[PDB]
């Protein structure tokens, strides 16, 4: 029950990107679910600040917050997008769109 | 009320690091408080995945989660630590201990 990568299928029409993304209709974004708490896992790759914060949160839960599970590396997808001239263009590596790694931060 | 850097003073005795950190006693870790929601701010430097996720969260709040405000860059501190030989040693740049920048991820 710790920080890891789960599935998240994102339909572009739901987020209102349909007016400038022809295809695909949906894609697999993934998301990062899971607690950042001790005992920690081997591959959350946690920062020292995350560790410190998680501990101060144990001592002072009402004041300080836990560290979050977040994407630590991202991947491109390809998209077929409406050009300002109204000409379908391909964006081969549309950066930052899918999750490669999660971690505590 | 958006993602930004607030103060967080961390006493090493509270987190149980006192047994191997002689000095300092306390330091300024900072933390990243604030919502990741729209309308966004100019300097959250948000990733496309964070933006997509925040939108899917609006449509499906019970299922998907918001994007978190997290440290995006960190700074060292210096620490005076007990060596395994029992000899105070200085760790001049103890990396990853303080927040330099926050962002939505
Ligand atoms: Cl899904
Ligand atoms: Cl466990
Ligand atoms: Cl641990
Ligand atoms: Cl670190
Ligand atoms: Cl809180
Ligand atoms: Cl472009
Ligand atoms: Cl490209
Ligand atoms: Cl290529
Ligand atoms: Cl891009
Ligand atoms: Cl404080
Ligand atoms: Cl606002
Ligand atoms: Cl915005
Ligand atoms: Cl991005
Ligand atoms: Cl949820
Ligand atoms: Cl060392
Ligand atoms: Cl050093
Ligand atoms: Cl130096
Ligand atoms: Cl280090
Ligand atoms: Na969904
Ligand atoms: Na408290
Ligand atoms: Na390629
Ligand atoms: Na405090
Ligand atoms: Na829902
Ligand atoms: Na220096």
Strand pairing report for A31-33 and A21-23: unpaired
Rg over alpha carbons for chain A, rounded to the nearest Å, is 18
Residue of A15, A68, A98 with shortest CB distance to B70: A68
Q: Kindly provide the b/e burial profile for residues A37-48, where b requires at least 16 CB atoms within 10 angstroms of the residue's own CB.
A: eeebeeebebbb
Contact criterion met (CB below 8 Å) for B66 and B53: yes
CA angle A65, A70, A71 (to 5 degrees): 165
* φ, ψ at B98 (rounded to 5°): -130, 155
A54 three-state secondary structure: helix
Separation CA B64–CA A31 (nearest Å): 8
Cβ within 8 Å of residue B51, ≥6 positions away: B40, B67, B104
Cβ within 8 Å of residue A96, ≥6 positions away: A74, A76, B47, B48, B49
Chain-centre distance of CA A16, in angstroms?
Answer: 19
Alpha-carbon distances of B80 from A70, A98, B19, B24, B86, rounded to whole Å: 32, 41, 11, 7, 12
Structure tokens at B35: 């919502």
Residue appearing with tokens 């990853």: B96
Closest C-alpha among B24, B90, B16, B49 to residue A58: B16
Separation CA A30–CA B104 (nearest Å): 16
Element (H, E) at A101: strand A88-104
Contact B53 A96 (CB under 8 A): no
CA angle A7, A11, A16 (to 5 degrees): 135
**CATH number of the structural domain A4-104:** 2.10.90.10
| Cross-strand partners of B31 | B6
CA angle B102, A5, A80 (to 5 degrees): 80
Cis status, amide bond into A97, omega within 30 of 0: no
Contact criterion met (CB below 8 Å) for B70 and B34: no
Interface residues of chain A, partner chain B, Cβ below 8 Å:
8, 10, 14-16, 29, 31, 33, 47-50, 52-53, 55-56, 59, 64-65, 67-68, 70-71, 74, 94-99, 105
- Approach to solving: X-ray
Contact criterion met (CB below 8 Å) for B69 and B43: no
Contact A49 B14 (CB under 8 A): no
Separation CA B3–CA B104 (nearest Å): 7
Please compute, for residue B92, the number of CA atoms within 13 A of its CA located in the half-sphere on the CB side.
0
Q: Kindly provide the b/e burial profile for residues B56-66, where b requires at least 16 CB atoms within 10 angstroms of the residue's own CB.
A: bbeeeeeebbb
Structure tokens at A7: 């599935």
Contact criterion met (CB below 8 Å) for B41 and A81: no
Residue A87 burial class via C-beta count within 10 angstroms: exposed 0-12, middle 13-18, buried 19 and up: exposed
- Nearest chain A CA: its distance from B67 CA (Å): 8
Dihedral sign of CA atoms B56, B2, A76, B100 in order? negative
For the CA atoms of B33, B34, B36, B40, the dihedral, rounded to the nearest 10 degrees, stands at -130
Which alpha helices (DSSP H) does A1-105 contain, by range?
A: 48-59
Separation CA B69–CA B40 (nearest Å): 12
Contact criterion met (CB below 8 Å) for A71 and A79: no
Longest dimension (CA), chain B: 58
């Amino acid at each position: 029950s710790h920080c890891q990568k789960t599935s998240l299928r994102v339909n572009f029409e739901d987020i209102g990107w349909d007016s400038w993304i022809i295809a695909p209709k949906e894609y697999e974004a993934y998301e990062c679910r899971g607690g950042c708490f001790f005992p920690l896992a081997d591959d959350v790759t946690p920062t020292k600040h995350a560790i410190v914060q998680t501990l101060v949160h144990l001592k002072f839960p009402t004041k300080v917050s836990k560290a979050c599970c977040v994407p630590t590396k991202l991947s491109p997808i390809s998209v077929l997008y409406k050009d300002d001239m109204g000409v379908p263009t391909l964006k081969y590596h549309y950066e930052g769109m899918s999750v490669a790694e999660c971690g505590c931060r």
